[PDB]
Amino acid sequence: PQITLWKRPLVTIRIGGQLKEALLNTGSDFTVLEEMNLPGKWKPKMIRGIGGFIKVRQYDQIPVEILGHKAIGTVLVGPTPVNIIGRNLLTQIGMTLNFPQITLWKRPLVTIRIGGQLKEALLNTGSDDTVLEEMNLPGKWKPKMIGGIGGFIKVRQYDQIPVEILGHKAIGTVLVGPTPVNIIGRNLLTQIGMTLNF
């Protein structure tokens, strides 16, 4: 199958007869499910994203059915808005990014060109928007706030910025602010014709 990035790549998953909506997230090393009871031992862990860290419980060897595929591996449980299917399980069910083909065994980091500069950024199907670490871009910008861990984070919003990604030109909105990693979100992934596929 093929899954478009026009919208959030949400899929219903099932864990032990519990059915939950989850986001297919190439920007996530791990799978993070909203608070639920799971059987077995777990250990506390801290995971990072935009906004900071949240404390989760790490359960190993949890079966998760995803679009008719059986994944089994580590599931982190904690206070998240959206169930996130990360690369640990995506790789197991054979998910790839395509536009050529990019596998998910490693972080899907690519070189982009923006403002004459080369930067490394993460292809992130779990992000609506493209967010870069602090830099100077030419043009007007608007103050914007985006939702993070612990609350809203302040960013600068630049519109109609040319970005070259994997030999493809995009022109679109780039947010600049305190992200742990440069992320290419669905706004630009769609422009370069990226889809998720098994």
Binding site: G27, F30, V32, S127, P180
Partner: peptide
Amino acid sequence: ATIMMQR
């Protein structure tokens, strides 16, 4: 783990 989600 780095878990990058953004809305």
